[PDB]
Symmetry: none
Subunit: 296 residues, 3 copies
Amino acid sequence: GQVEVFNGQDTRDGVNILIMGTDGRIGQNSVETRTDSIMVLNVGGSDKKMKLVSFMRDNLVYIDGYSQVINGRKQTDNKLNVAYELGEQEGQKGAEMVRQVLKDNFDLDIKYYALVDFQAFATAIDTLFPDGVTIDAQFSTLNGRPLTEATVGDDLYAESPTQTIKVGKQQMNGSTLLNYARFRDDDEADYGRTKRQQQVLTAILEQIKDPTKLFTGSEALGKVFAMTSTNVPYTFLLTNGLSVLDGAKNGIEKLTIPELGDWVDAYDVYGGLGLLVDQNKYQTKLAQMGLRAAAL
Amino acid sequence: GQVEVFNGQDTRDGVNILIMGTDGRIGQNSVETRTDSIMVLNVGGSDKKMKLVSFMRDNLVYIDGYSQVINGRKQTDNKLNVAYELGEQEGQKGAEMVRQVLKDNFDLDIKYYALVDFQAFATAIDTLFPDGVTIDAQFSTLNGRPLTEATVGDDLYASPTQTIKVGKQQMNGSTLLNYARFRDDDEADYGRTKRQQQVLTAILEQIKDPTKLFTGSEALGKVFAMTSTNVPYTFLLTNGLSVLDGAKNGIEKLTIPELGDWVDAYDVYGGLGLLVDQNKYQTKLAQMGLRAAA
Amino acid sequence: GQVEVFNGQDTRDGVNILIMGTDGRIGQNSVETRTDSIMVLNVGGSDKKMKLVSFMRDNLVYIDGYSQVINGRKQTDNKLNVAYELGEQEGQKGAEMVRQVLKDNFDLDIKYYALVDFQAFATAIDTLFPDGVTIDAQFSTLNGRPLTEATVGDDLYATETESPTQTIKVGKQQMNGSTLLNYARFRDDDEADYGRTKRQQQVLTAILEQIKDPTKLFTGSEALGKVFAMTSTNVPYTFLLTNGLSVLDGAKNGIEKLTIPELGDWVDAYDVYGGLGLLVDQNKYQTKLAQMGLRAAA
């Protein structure tokens, strides 16, 4: 929610930005919110390519202060999506808590954050995109069978409607696009959701028209800002903005951590089921992608 | 517990025998009993060498009927030492339950079992070895510091304790059991497995005059009385001296998993166990000749 | 191991610091003796050079209480790396026992100690050096043949039934903690342990030289803290604040190095356990140590 502490750190190549979707509505935030999306976007690296990494919410992670230590062994015994909630409960430390965790588990240094709730997102998209966003809607299988449409809970309308998205290229308004990003009810589960979220983010950046005019000054862009929580400096947007919007047209190198299937099921300390992952291996991949650029 | 169901299967090379120590006293409710050791001993293999594998008790394992299945993924969500208890509770299926588990998780085929409680073991050893068993007592570190002696709970008189100094000595049954039970060093249960292996090896090596099997010894009989086993007596008569001689050639040993070679994880009861790479250990078992699948 | 007794003594020129690498590997299945390196570093001496002396681990030494006495002749009948283990067995007296021995055999007075285990070292280096340490890897011959690479046991990933290895090519490269440790531990060439001492000295020197911003170091760094946590040392923090940059600069000026004994300068002989050690002319080396300014004594 709106105010967030952040002790951003610099990375050796580019700038890492933590990006999170929360489930609240414009004006509630904090202890009534959950994380639906956790991404790190690297911009301005030497290779001139943007990188986007989704962390699956069920990632089991060591949360300092809250996780056990058996012998000397730190336990990855909490789900990652918990870290935000623990921080909102501590007091405006949700983004910060995610940052500390990603640092401790994946050795990522992250400089800035941006947070959106669902309602903001939907409104924001209607504001920016009067003809909606072009998306090529795609789903995985269900028990091996290909899907050609998906039923999603239409959560922005409370007393419990749903919505059906057919596969293929179409225009999506904010509500649709949010719903599309939230869908997880196929063989790929949260992993496939990460790919849709990545797809949506990419699409937004690619389809912004008149990119300069935003910065010069736009009431639309302002309305959006009002509905967002971010510590990204405005001069950073002025100096790096068009490069990001253009770099998005060239396409973004994407990764989900962990990759599909590349995990073992295990219980968190609360008796929930999470993903135990080989963090070292993913630290090496992050280095290879230029998000921490270490060791070799 | 005394009576045990067993649907033994043959292996390609030698014969695999499940060997378990239990914590009961000579004649007890086995439903009230715990496994203190889980081993598989391979005898009569082509290379003329015995193989001995300890499974750490905290191994997380899939127990059919009791373990979860998530999106068609079988979960190794129970500790191995639980499998015995589940079997004793079902009714005389403790050894059998361990067998089905070892088969399902490690693809081992096991033909026979032998089970001993602590009290039996100690008495057995006093009976067989009047001057005790020679053991070179050795412990790991404790917080990095060398141990030159270990304090062991003397549970057969429980609760007093006993101190075993490091080095070659004679051990009576109670000592030897205590030595095999000790786990209070940096190696914890893993180091215990190695002492258990050491003790078993020592016993086989130090049996004098194995012709008492033949002549019929009341000592050997006393031992049998205190043991639960489905090993056929003619199998002992035909393969006994080979096993005792195979001990002179030395025993290839393994603990599964190996020290450190695991990740901590919760069982379904909220206990903490060892999540292991079972495939890799299936390969090692094959390489040792317990599974002989290439 | 962490807590250690030490009855440090002062020297007439500079300050002598005992530095030891220990093998932590819980393995037990992964240890013969747990001292992998024994060094004395002299800082703040008059000649304005740092001195580093390696003692080869197989040095045969008189260990009071444990060594024989024949016709009133004290016997150098134990290896030096034993003295640590005898101290750890006595109760957190490992560093102290090495101190007493170095005093009794080489008449060195040593004020402080620092001890690191292998795992700590590797982690410590990863923590401090995210791009690794630059090392110019160099090996001796093997049976007369030049090596252009070495196969080194990767002992941090060793079990009782496995033994993975790594190949280090000769020449300038970046080494992470595991590599660097492996490089320091390699002894499988014509120079054996002697050549290992030189690689250990090389690594230590490299570390000191390649620390950036010492200014920020002793004055608030969570990295340095993590390192401290993994180290056992009785060096006072104000001593680091007053003499730290001098040591890091003294390293840039280059370090006078000695291995005791020097290559070939020994006779092979059995310890009381039937192991093979180095019988050395301790007197001669006492004079050399005096000449280097580590004992500057009569």
